[PDB]
Ligand binder design. Structure first.
Ligand SMILES: Cc1nc(-c2ccccn2)nc(NCCNc2cccc(C(F)(F)F)n2)c1Cl
Ligand SMILES: [Co+2]
Ligand SMILES: [Co+2]
Ligand SMILES: [Co+2]
Ligand SMILES: [K+]
Length: 304
């Protein structure tokens, strides 16, 4: 395999981390290939769940706990710390909140969160590589509690970063916030990509096409599929009680992605940097509730 940039996987991984049996598990946790039968049963359907009162409270809880875990990860971002170390802390933090780390064994994904450095777009596998000053790194967290998944991610600076990294990260966050600002009953899902691409393009950046936002609730990924790029053909209209993510991945160079031999790590084909931010959203009568909002600060970690 010809790698697209400087990053390489750093093996072996530590033995898979166990989740105590008292923590409730999603269907795929114990499937040999990590397949989710509940998800497969709805594969290719475009109908969107309207959450019940009980569902909304369940989503509120797991989304709050997921934010807590992302904040744990944020505190560990420094030169020399390996992404494996971040994942261990994350794994323990999920357990401490009586949650299952949703990525663990999801379609055999080996770790409990995704750590995406520099040219990795998404789905980076936590490994023995120490973070380097100048790096940017996304940590993507999803927790499962009482039948519900909650999903967020932020990109972080490792020590001092160059002006381009600052611009990419700032712009990506601005893309996310502009899209969220447009969310309310009656807006088409396909509209969000128009807003996101307009802003990214205005700042000399491109928009990943192969990976999208998604419905989430009792399933990790379900309808709607939410592309982040302009003139896309996403199906559906926002309604009060819909829950979904917006998680735009934006790139310094071209939009094209490819996957490492590990079957997971998505990287820019040109080896230039990519950044991502993600929230889980609940559509309300007036707009939307950001379920994964940071509670003790108005701003994401990179600003702070
Ligand atoms: C957005 C997304 N994320 C993850 C994932 C998987 C492991 C850890 C974190 N995230 N898995 C996903 N899909 C799991 C089912 N298999 C598929 C199907 C189509 C496309 C993909 C892929 F690889 F994400 F593009 N995976 C998706 Cl759609
Ligand atoms: Co994912
Ligand atoms: Co995520
Ligand atoms: Co997501
Ligand atoms: K990245």
């Amino acid at each position: 395999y010809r790698y697209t940039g400087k990053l390489r996987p750093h093996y072996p991984l530590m033995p898979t981390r166990p989740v105590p049996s008292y923590i409730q598990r999603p269907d795929y946790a114990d499937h040999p290939l990590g397949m989710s039968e509940s998800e497969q049963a709805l594969k290719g359907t475009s109908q969107i769940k309207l959450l019940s009162s009980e569902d909304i409270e369940g989503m509120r809880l797991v989304c709050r706990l997921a934010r807590e875990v992302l904040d744990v990860a944020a505190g560990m971002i420094k030169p020399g710390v390996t992404t494996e170390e971040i994942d261990h802390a994350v794994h323990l933090a999920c357990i401490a909140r009586n949650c299952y780390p949703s990525p663990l064994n999801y379609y055999n994904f080996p770790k409990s969160c995704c750590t995406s450095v520099n040219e990795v777009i998404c789905h980076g596998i936590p490994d023995r590589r120490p973070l380097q000053e100048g790096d940017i790194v996304n940590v993507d967290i999803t927790l499962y509690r009482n039948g519900y998944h909650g999903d967020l991610n932020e990109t972080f600076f490792v020590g001092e970063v160059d002006d381009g990294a600052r611009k990419l990260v700032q712009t990506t966050y601005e893309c996310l916030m502009q899209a969220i600002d447009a969310v309310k009953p009656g807006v088409r899902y396909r509209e969000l990509g128009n807003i996101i691409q307009k802003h990214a393009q205005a700042n000399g950046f491109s928009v990943v096409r192969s990976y999208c936002g998604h419905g989430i609730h009792k399933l990790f990924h379900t309808a709607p599929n939410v592309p982040h790029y302009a003139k896309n053909k996403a199906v559906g209209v926002m309604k009060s009680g819909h829950v979904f993510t917006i998680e735009p991945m934006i790139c310094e160079g071209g939009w094209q992605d490819e996957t490492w031999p590990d079957g997971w790590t998505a990287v820019t084909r040109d080896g230039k940097r990519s950044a991502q931010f993600e929230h889980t959203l609940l559509v309300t009568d007036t707009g939307c509730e950001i379920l994964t909002r940071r509670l003790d600060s108005a701003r994401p970690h990179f600003m702070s």
